[PDB]
Write a protein that binds this ligand. Structure first.
Ligand SMILES: *[C@@H]1O[C@H](CO)[C@@H](O)[C@H](O)[C@H]1NC(C)=O
Ligand SMILES: *[C@@H]1O[C@H](CO)[C@@H](O)[C@H](O)[C@H]1NC(C)=O
Ligand SMILES: *[C@@H]1O[C@H](CO)[C@@H](O)[C@H](O)[C@H]1NC(C)=O
Ligand SMILES: *[C@@H]1O[C@H](CO)[C@@H](O)[C@H](O)[C@H]1NC(C)=O
Ligand SMILES: *[C@@H]1O[C@H](CO)[C@@H](O)[C@H](O)[C@H]1NC(C)=O
Length: 351
């Protein structure tokens, strides 16, 4: 057939010379072809400017006239594109973002420029791509190429590593309280890589948190309130490109009861010449399960009266006249009594 017939579907490969900033067009043909005015030694058209059309008329002894007129639509310079890692730092442990950047202008129409990627075995067609649900602490090879009129003119590879993902959780051997103001937590460290621990103890109203060293596996909880339930939470964390907290292990205990605080604002007031009215306010810290107010009346370093009520209101009647009395009032929570509030008041009249 005609050379236009034999070479109607001829393909070209573009080879960039970084030193000259010029392209070579390699004609994809077996036989040593002849080119018109312009020479094509071997089967290569040399020194082509980027983004400029060149015409080549192709013939061979095996085909007749007309010659195959081939238009070389030369691509942009390879150094005008850069493969950039756009990965979001908060999601670096499970994601990859890659994007080609156009670092210098070129006159070629961008509508004929296509970008391809292969990450693992997934194939993408776009200027930028995103991979999600990646396993942390792994390495992946993402290959990419750029096409002009579906012809590859450049390519690159990017090897990416995924950051440090979620450690924890630690295992509690036991968390208990053997005292009223103290508690303890015994645990085992998690198998994953971590930087430190976080302990939080929650009571009814307050929540207190602490950062402990990664080396210790026991914590002595000090300065606790008697007869109160504490919900402990222990988790491990790591400082990667962002802080990553692991799962939290939970445990609880109620601290032991203790003697209550002293009763508040105790008063003794005369109701007659031989009778007193004793009243006080509840202790700030009851520290126990039940409620009871006790009154001890002493005279001459000897206990003369011992009364108890649900409320701190005592009417001490029919006492001896002209006698100095000691009034010891205290709360009893059911488990322990409180330190007595001591007041002295003497009776009037004469015996
Ligand atoms: C293009 O891909 C080939 C493998 O297909 C590779 O050998 C070559 O180095 C890549 N080019 C660049 C500049 O990364
Ligand atoms: C744990 O936290 C403290 C601050 O609370 C910090 O000074 C210390 O360096 C951390 N430990 C480790 C091993 O990173
Ligand atoms: C991670 O733990 C720290 C305390 O170590 C806390 O301030 C932060 O809010 C926690 N974040 C999450 C998402 O659990
Ligand atoms: C005790 O009660 C009296 C009378 O109500 C009051 O003036 C005083 O401020 C109270 N003291 C305390 C410590 O609450
Ligand atoms: C007063 O009675 C209480 C309640 O039974 C008792 O615990 C306490 O010992 C008595 N006081 C004295 C000084 O005996």
């Amino acid at each position: 057939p005609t050379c236009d017939e034999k070479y109607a579907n001829i393909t070209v490969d573009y080879l960039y010379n970084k030193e000259t900033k010029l392209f070579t067009a390699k004609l994809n043909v077996n036989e040593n072809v002849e080119c018109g005015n312009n020479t094509c030694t071997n089967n290569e058209v040399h020194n082509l400017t980027e983004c400029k059309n060149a015409s080549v008329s192709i013939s061979h002894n095996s085909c007749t006239a007309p010659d195959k007129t081939l238009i070389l639509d030369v691509p942009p310079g390879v150094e005008k594109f850069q493969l950039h890692d756009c990965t979001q730092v908060e999601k670096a442990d499970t994601t990859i973002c890659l994007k080609w950047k156009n670092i210098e202008t070129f006159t070629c129409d961008t509508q004929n420029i296509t970008y391809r990627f292969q990450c693992g075995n997934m194939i993408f067609d776009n200027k930028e791509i995103k991979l999600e649900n990646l396993e942390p602490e792994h390495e992946y090879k993402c290959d990419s190429e750029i096409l002009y009129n579906n012809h590859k003119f450049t390519n690159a590879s990017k090897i990416i590593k995924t950051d440090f993902g979620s450690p924890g959780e630690p295992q509690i051997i036991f968390c208990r309280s053997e005292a009223a103001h103290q508690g303890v937590i015994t645990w085992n460290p998690p198998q994953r890589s971590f930087h430190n621990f976080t302990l939080c103890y929650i009571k009814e109203t307050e929540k207190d948190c602490l950062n402990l060293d990664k080396n210790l596996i026991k914590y002595d909880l000090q300065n606790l309130k008697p007869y109160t339930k504490y919900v402990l939470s222990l988790h491990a964390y790591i400082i990667a490109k962002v802080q990553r907290n692991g799962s939290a292990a939970m445990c609880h205990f109620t601290t032991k009861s203790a003697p209550p605080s002293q009763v508040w604002n105790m008063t003794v007031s005369m109701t007659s010449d031989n009778s007193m009215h004793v009243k006080c306010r509840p202790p700030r810290d009851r520290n126990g399960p039940h409620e009871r107010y006790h009154l001890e009346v002493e005279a001459g370093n000897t206990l003369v009266r011992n009364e108890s009520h649900k409320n701190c209101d005592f009417r001490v009647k029919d006492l001896q006249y002209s006698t100095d009395y000691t009034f010891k009032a205290y709360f009893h929570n059911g488990d322990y009594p409180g330190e007595p509030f001591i007041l002295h008041h003497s009776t009037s009249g004469t015996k």
